[PDB]
Structure 1
Amino acid sequence: LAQMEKSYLEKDERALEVTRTVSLAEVYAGLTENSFILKDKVTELVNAGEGSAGTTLNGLNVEGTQLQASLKLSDLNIATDYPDGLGNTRRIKQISV
């Protein structure tokens, strides 16, 4: 335990806390493969609770009585927003909606 605490204290450093705002209208509008505008596809899929939108894993889908909106984090390219000289372990702290 003391070896692990020593390695923790020698390897713990501060941070670089970054918040990134992602709007799904911009992602779904600039998706280049079954891209769509969000505000009209939501009313199309809510007034008729059957359809889908976009591709799989980056689109809308209605499953029974449950609309879900999807996203792939590899398709956001958050790891290349800042240059790679400031660290490679870029891990999410928290996500709020």
Structure 2
Amino acid sequence: LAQMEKSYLEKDERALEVTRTVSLAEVYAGLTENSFILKDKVTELVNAGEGSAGTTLNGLNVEGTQLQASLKLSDLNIATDYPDGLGNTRRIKQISV
């Protein structure tokens, strides 16, 4: 325990805490494959409760009585928003909607 504690105290540095606000309508518009307008696809899929939107993993789908909107995190280029000279362990801290 003292070995692991001393290693944690020697390898703990401060931070680089970056908040990135992402608008899903922008991602759905700049999808470059079956891209769409979010505000029209939501009323289309609500008044017609059957369809989906865009490709898989990057779009909407209606499943029974559950409208779900998907998003692939690799396609957002978050780790390359900054130079890589500031750290590679770029982990998500917290997400709010």
- Normalization by structure 2: what TM-score? 0.99
SS of the equivalent of 2:49 reads coil
Report deviation, 1:43: 0.2
After TM superposition, give the deviation of residue 29 of structure 1 in Å: 0.1
- Per-residue deviation at 1:22? 0.5
Provide the rounded CA distance (Å) in 1 between the counterparts of 2:6 and 2:67.
49
User: Structure 2: how far apart are the matches of 1:83 and 1:70?
Assistant: 28
Say what the alpha-carbon RMSD is for the aligned residues: 0.3
* Runs of 5+ unmatched residues, structure 2: none
Rounded to whole Å, the distance in 2 between the matches of 1:37 and 1:24 is 10
TM, length-normalised to structure 1 = 0.99
**Cα distance, 1:61 vs structure 2:** 0.2
Query: Structure 1 runs of 4+ off > 6 angstroms?
Result: none
Tell me which residue corresponds to 2:14: 14
Alignment coverage as a number of residue pairs: 97
Percent identity of equivalent pairs: 100
Deviations 1:16-67 (A, max 9, x none): 0000000010000000000001000000000011000010000000000010
